[PDB]
Design a binder for this molecule. Sequence first.
Ligand SMILES: Nc1ncnc2c1ncn2[C@@H]1O[C@H](COP(=O)(O)OP(=O)(O)OP(O)(O)=S)[C@@H](O)[C@H]1O
Ligand SMILES: [Mg+2]
Ligand SMILES: [Mg+2]
Length: 269
Amino acid sequence: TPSHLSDRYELGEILGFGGMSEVHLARDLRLHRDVAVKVLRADLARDPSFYLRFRREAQNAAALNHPAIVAVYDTGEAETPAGPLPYIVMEYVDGVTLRDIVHTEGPMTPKRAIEVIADACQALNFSHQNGIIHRDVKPANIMISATNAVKVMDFGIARAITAQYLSPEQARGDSVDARSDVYSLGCVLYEVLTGEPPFTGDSPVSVAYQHVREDPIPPSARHEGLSADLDAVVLKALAKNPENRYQTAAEMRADLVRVHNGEPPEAPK
Ligand SMILES: Nc1ncnc2c1ncn2[C@@H]1O[C@H](COP(=O)(O)OP(=O)(O)OP(O)(O)=S)[C@@H](O)[C@H]1O
Ligand SMILES: [Mg+2]
Ligand SMILES: [Mg+2]
């Protein structure tokens, strides 16, 4: 990992290293600005059709342009001993994923919470109208800027038209669409509120099963200060039946902005 990709993007700190890539905080030497570069796990997973998933992820996010969605600025690959090293240059978000905020602060204030996810909705609704589906919406792919701004960031598994956060439909290879993301955000909205996903399981299958077989314990019954009006929103988006939940993410937001003010949720039960 040449601390100087293509001789232009000076690598610095390490913002994170998963099981596929290593994201570094870099310096664009030409534009004198800080950027976040994503590097395909130094060849350890660069020979297979994995490079495709990477190239097609850079371009699947490059197709979108919205504040809440991390922008892509450039792609490429630098040459190194073992071969090509595909990198992606994104906007830098000095922040924290929600996975973190829910780990060192516990649950978010209902209103704080409502606020975030409503912004996340705005990003997905856009992503949708542009024919992109983020098949991977989880607390670890939504970031909170150092100025409390929301950023949605992982498209590695997104297709243009760890299952604690997957939809029944997406559980199997079934129908995965707009509403799937809608169902996912419902889990996030749920964790940021209780401090946990609607369903916990010792093994993946027990969880999947729970998603498509058990009603999500109402938020109120799971945590303190929870407006049974907020329950109406959470449990709606978590409805096992696509048709019975919000059809668009803007429709979900609409019912979040409602609760945020003081209005009645146009959600049932
Ligand atoms: N633009 C960015 N700015 C700051 N940190 C970022 C940025 N993009 C990613 N990160 C950090 O890098 C971590 C890994 O991001 P991902 O893109 O989801 O990683 P990944 O290699 O796809 O790992 P997986 O497959 O999602 S488990 C994040 O959870 C952040 O801490
Ligand atoms: Mg991640
Ligand atoms: Mg990914």
